[PDB]
Amino acid sequence: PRPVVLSGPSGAGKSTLLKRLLQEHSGIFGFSVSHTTRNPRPGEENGKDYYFVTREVMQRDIAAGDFIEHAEFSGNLYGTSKVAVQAVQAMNRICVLDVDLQGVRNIKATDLRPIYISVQPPSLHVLEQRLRQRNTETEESLVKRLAAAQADMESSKEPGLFDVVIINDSLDQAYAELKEALSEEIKKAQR
Numbered sequence: 001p002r003p004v005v006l007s008g009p010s011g012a013g014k015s016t017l018l019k020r021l022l023q024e025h026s027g028i029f030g031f032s033v034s035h036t037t038r039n040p041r042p043g044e045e046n047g048k049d050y051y052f053v054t055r056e057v058m059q060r061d062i063a064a065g066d067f068i069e070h071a072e073f074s075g076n077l078y079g080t081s082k083v084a085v086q087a088v089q090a091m092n093r094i095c096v097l098d099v100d101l102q103g104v105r106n107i108k109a110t111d112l113r114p115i116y117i118s119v120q121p122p123s124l125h126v127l128e129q130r131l132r133q134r135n136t137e138t139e140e141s142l143v144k145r146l147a148a149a150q151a152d153m154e155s156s157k158e159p160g161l162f163d164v165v166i167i168n169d170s171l172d173q174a175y176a177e178l179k180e181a182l183s184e185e186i187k188k189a190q191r
């Protein structure tokens, strides 16, 4: 099977859909634990949700070639390390990655050759509402999210960028569509 890249706007439901997929199919899928320089949100665990490091550690890691890709997003650094992807492969699991649009384009030139899935909100208004209920960003950081989010929604319609686009209105339906898009991936892994 192939690795899986989830991309979409901030708050459209990338994390929520992925977290469920990793519970139902914990034997099939493995999460790529990115590095980030942003502060952990309550409930996030180092080594599970992210590798939480300072900017000095992240830059020294970049200088050492640790990362398949890395991008700056809303004043913080994020990156997919080779070590993170190899950890999933050494477990005999399909690697699932959660990256922004920059990561998608970055990954499009690596040897990962993954499936690309875009998770989109029903409207940009609903996306702002979902981010407000989250309340993990300041209004200065919140405003920057919507600027980057509109670029994601526009690039979702690019002819050869994403393999599957999923509108997250109902989690039951969106996860049902996520499983349907990964049926071939699951079938190959299980054989």
Ligand SMILES: Nc1nc2c(ncn2[C@@H]2O[C@H](COP(=O)(O)OP(=O)(O)O)[C@@H](O)[C@H]2O)c(=O)[nH]1
Binding pocket: 007, 008, 009, 010, 011, 015, 034, 035, 038, 069, 070, 071, 073, 078, 079, 080, 081, 098, 099, 100, 102, 103, 104, 106
């Ligand atoms: N390129 C890249 N992007 C990432 C990585 N990890 C996270 N991102 C993206 O950076 C953005 C910041 O996400 P986050 O801080 O968790 O806020 P949230 O997506 O709104 O929950 C998200 O849209 C992720 O898709 C990474 O390792 N590489």
Ligand SMILES: Nc1ncnc2c1ncn2[C@@H]1O[C@H](COP(=O)(O)OP(=O)(O)O)[C@@H](O)[C@H]1O
Binding pocket: 008, 009, 010, 011, 012, 013, 014, 015, 016, 017, 130, 131, 133, 134, 168, 169, 170, 171
């Ligand atoms: N289907 C949905 N309907 C309503 N709200 C949602 C839905 N999916 C996610 N949300 C809300 O939006 C936010 C989603 O954040 P997250 O799952 O981290 O998405 P992303 O990883 O794309 O930022 C959460 O605060 C959640 O409460």
